Design a protein around this ligand. Structure first.
Ligand code: K
Ligand code: K
Ligand code: MG
Ligand code: MG
Ligand code: MG
Ligand code: MG
Ligand code: MG
Ligand code: MG
Ligand code: MG
Ligand code: NA
Length: 186
RNA sequence: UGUCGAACGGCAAGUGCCCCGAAGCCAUCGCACGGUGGUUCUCGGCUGAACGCCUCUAAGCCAGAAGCCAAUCCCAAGACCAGAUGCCCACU
């Protein structure tokens, strides 16, 4: 067992990170995020004067140590979520039947996927903003916006997995909704 | 057919026999009704290290089968209900 293993992260000026009982609260501009990490059993420290976040595993083998970088990635993702945000742009790809997508409030409706009469409905949580790009700029583009990377990516994946092609050769029937670009709001 | 003399009324033939026949029982041979949510499988994914890259997995999440569990349905306190009540009596 390695006696001490640690990971370090620089904290920007406009964000504050608070740690208490393995519960991380990252609060910059544009909002605040909270991550429950009570399942990890690590030692989390924040030096506010030096703007550093440190996670330490004491007497760890490979399995406990591998969670150090995972915690660092999660805290980093929260930081860029509260500073710049997350924006996912997904595209509707079709061969013959156009994919008609309607976005009203927090509800997405997909019709005419491969000519099916069934309507595919999805309810986006209020923490993720959904919008449709005007067709003149980009054709068949849905944009998901939020501060939580996991919430934003889950919403895009949920939409993508709704329009799966069944009982067909997927190498030839490439119709679906795929996320094209992943960027930041600011 | 026999029989009380005939007619009437019947009666015998272990319901004489034939037709129709209510009530009741009864036929997918007739008619009525047969519903709601979760936990997971397999699998597909998200985030993501180990291993600066990568990766559904290692810690975390999402979606998810006629399986499984509960609701609904049937019996139901030896499941000993200090559940709620109506009248007496007992205690007071
Ligand atoms: K006879
Ligand atoms: K008859
Ligand atoms: Mg076929
Ligand atoms: Mg007779
Ligand atoms: Mg005689
Ligand atoms: Mg019957
Ligand atoms: Mg999986
Ligand atoms: Mg099931
Ligand atoms: Mg009872
Ligand atoms: Na990945």
């Amino acid at each position: 067992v390695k006696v001490k293993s640690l990971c370090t992260l620089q904290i920007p000026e406009g964000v504050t990170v608070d740690v208490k009982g393995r519960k991380v609260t990252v609060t910059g501009k544009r909002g605040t995020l909270t991550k429950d990490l009570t399942h990890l059993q690590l030692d989390l420290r924040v030096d506010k004067k030096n703007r550093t976040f440190t996670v330490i595993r004491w007497f760890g083998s490979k399995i406990p140590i591998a969670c150090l970088n995972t915690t660092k990635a999660h805290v980093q993702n929260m930081i860029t979520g509260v500073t710049k945000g997350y924006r996912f742009k997904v595209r509707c790809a079709y061969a013959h039947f156009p994919i008609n997508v309607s976005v009203d409030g927090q509800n997405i409706e997909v019709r005419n996927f491969l000519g099916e009469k069934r309507v595919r409905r999805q309810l986006v949580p209020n923490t993720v903003k959904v919008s449709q790009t005007d067709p003149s700029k980009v054709k068949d583009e849905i944009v998901f916006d939020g501060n939580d990377l996991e919430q934003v990516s889950r919403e895009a994946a949920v939409l993508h997995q709704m329009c799966l092609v069944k009982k067909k050769d997927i190498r030839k029937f490439l119709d679906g909704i795929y996320v094209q670009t992943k960027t930041n709001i600011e």
